[PDB]
Structures are given as C-alpha cells and as structure tokens.
DNA sequence: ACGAGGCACTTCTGGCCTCTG
DNA sequence: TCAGAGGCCAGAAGTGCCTCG
C-alpha cells in the first residue's frame, strides 16, 4: 500500500530495466524497510562476498547497494533475498551506473548508515 | 500457526507416508477459518475437484476433495502453502475417503459448505 | 491395501554467450 | 562498448507413472 513501488525516482537512470534479460551483473540496489536493511546487509555480504556494500537513508526506508566479484542474475539476487522477507516491501535491482548511483547515495536526500570500505566507490577502484 | 496435526480421531484415515512418490485422488487439509475459504474456492477452480467440502474442527476448519485425476500429496500441499500467509496449514492424503468425509460431517465435526447439494452418499465411493 | 522407491519427464534456476541498435 | 532480448545449458526441483513388498 504506502510500501514503494519503485525505487526513488532520482535513482531511476542508473538501474538496470530489463525484463526479459538473462544478463548477469555484477552491482545490484535493493529497497526495503528499516527492519530489513540491517539483517539484508551480512547475510548479502557473506552469501555473495561482496566486493563493497554499503547501507543508505532513502525517504523513511533504506537502500543496500553492492559490488560482487563475480556476476549474478538480478532473479537470483532477488530469490535469496526474498526468501529472508514475506512479509515486507522489496524491490532489487541491477544498477548500470555504479559510480553514479553511489555518489548519488552518499547526497541529498540519501545519507550513508553504514559501509563495508570508508569512502566506497570514490575512494577505491573496484576495477 | 496453532494445531499440529489432524484430531487424532481423523488419523486412522489418512496416509501418513513421508517417502511414497504414490498418487492420490482424495486429500484433506487443516487450516483457519479465512484460508479454508479461499482454499475452497480455489482448490476447486485449480484441480476441478470431482467434490470439495469445508468443515468445521475444533477452533479451525478441515477441508476434504476428491480430484478427477491422480495427485502427489506434496504437489497439493505446494499449491496450498503458496496461499498462505504465514498461517497453518496441515496437508495430508485421505486413504479412507467415505469413513473420513462421513466422520467430518457428524460430532464433533460439521459441515459448512460443500460442492454437491446435500453431500455425499456411500455409494460415490469405491 | 499402502508405504517405499525406481523412473521419466518437465519446469525452474541461474549461469554462460551473441545479437542488435 | 552498452544494455536489453533472448538462445542455450546443466543441475536441481517438481510432479506424475509404475512395481515391489
């Protein structure tokens, strides 16, 4: 209902918007609640090892973005991770624009809670 | 969430089978009042049951169907958890199909609705 | 009878890759 | 190159058939 059905607008021109891709990337945004952001967040890193995350303040819910080393589906990113859920709002995603879509995070009106490396994608190649 | 199986007194009608890839054409499952319902409605539609009625037990509701064709009990079983709803849901194949309708229809048991005007009879059963 | 379980699909899952503008 | 659409693939999971005890 008052749940997201996308996420925020302003992010828009950096993910992915495929549907019927079988693509494989390797930087995915998702949007939850509060609740789900905190415990998303490990259990991500650890089942994907990811190569950077970081957790964002989006309009009273939170983004996760991320870097893994290796390529996924969105589906398949979006299956482990609604498998955690029921039971709550959460829309995944695969992100074109990983520089764009980070800086973007880190501003006006989204802020950084939390992320794996101190400065992420502006301070570190993740080449 | 609540109940954790069928009333014991159901039990001698049931499969209790965990490792049978065995089909069957009469099944009953133990859910809420809202879920039993819908489950109705939609057990119907889906299978195109040959019969389906919804029953009262114990708190809960109990519904029995009989399909036209032969099913796993998982298979009916991952039909009915993806219409729940962290909600209860005991899914189970019905070895003694008459002796199990008729016991739900008399105390402690009732029927609610059923899909044939005045139930089922004995014969019908084979 | 009825539970175990061999078997045979078929559908789902999650990667690969090329094509196309 | 990029990114979305989609061919193809292999291994897992699903949902039937059967016969054996």
Redesign the pocket.
């Known amino acids: 209902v008052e749940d997201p059905k996308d996420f925020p607008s302003e992010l828009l021109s950096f ?10 990337l390797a930087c995915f945004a998702i949007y939850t609640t509060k609740e789900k952001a905190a415990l998303l967040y490990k259990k991500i890193m650890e089942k994907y090892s990811v190569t950077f995350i970081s957790r964002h303040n989006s309009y009273n819910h939170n983004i996760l973005f991320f870097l893994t080393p ?4 969105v ?6 991770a609604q498998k955690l859920c029921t039971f709550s709002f959460l829309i995944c995603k ?1 992100v ?2 990983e520089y764009l879509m980070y800086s973007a995070l880190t501003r006006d009106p989204f802020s950084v809670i939390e992320e794996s490396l101190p400065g992420g994608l502006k301070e570190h190649d993740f080449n």
Do not use: Q
């Open positions: 993910l992915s918007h495929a549907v019927f891709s079988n693509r494989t290796h390529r996924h589906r589906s398949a990113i979006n299956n482990y695969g074109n624009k």
